[PDB]
């Protein structure tokens, strides 16, 4: 490994994603294959490319060293194996969705999805999301309200 001069970058970089981010998910990759990463990188791909991460770090000692910053709801995620996912642009989006759909294709556990932060809380798969731009679901709420 590297000394501190390097354990600091994995911090100053990874924590300015939290400081400058959008949504957070969860997942434990016990059996995390590489067809695994391959896929989810195309997903990050659709979800821009390299706007997304997953930098395995669940050393509390790392991606909690980014938490007493923001998201101290994660002192509780960080135990055991974890795969932290941050969003920069994009809706508070679909990121959420396929992690459940992925891991529900066996694709290993999902930490039961211990969940995360947009609010400041816990678990439950939501597509309360990428409807986003479904302001059309407030366009159809126009003419249909005007007519009916």
């Amino acid at each position: 490994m590297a000394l501190n001069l390097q354990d600091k970058q994995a911090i100053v970089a990874e924590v300015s994603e939290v400081a400058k981010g959008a949504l957070s998910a969860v997942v434990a990759d016990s059996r995390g294959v590489t067809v695994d990463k391959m896929t989810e990188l195309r997903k990050a791909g659709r979800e821009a490319g390299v706007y997304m991460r997953v930098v395995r770090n669940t050393l509390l000692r790392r991606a909690v060293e980014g938490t007493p910053f923001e998201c101290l709801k994660d002192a509780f995620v960080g135990p055991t194996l974890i795969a932290y996912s941050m969003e920069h642009p994009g809706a508070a989006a679909r990121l959420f969705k396929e992690f459940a759909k992925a891991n529900a294709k066996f694709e290993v556990k999902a930490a039961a999805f211990e969940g995360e932060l947009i609010p400041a809380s816990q678990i439950d798969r939501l597509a309360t999301l990428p409807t986003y731009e479904e302001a059309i679901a407030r366009l159809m709420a126009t003419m249909k309200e005007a007519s009916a």
């Binding site: 302001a135 407030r138 126009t142 005007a146």
Partner: peptide, 30 residues
């Protein structure tokens, strides 16, 4: 209110205008 006076603007408008707006149209009614 005037329905045409709220269609001519309600088909043509910006973006982030809406993004910090229709996370809340859901609130007054629904």
């Amino acid at each position: 209110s005037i329905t045409k006076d709220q269609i001519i603007e309600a088909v043509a408008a910006m973006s982030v205008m809406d993004v910090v707006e229709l996370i809340s149209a859901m609130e007054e009614k629904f």
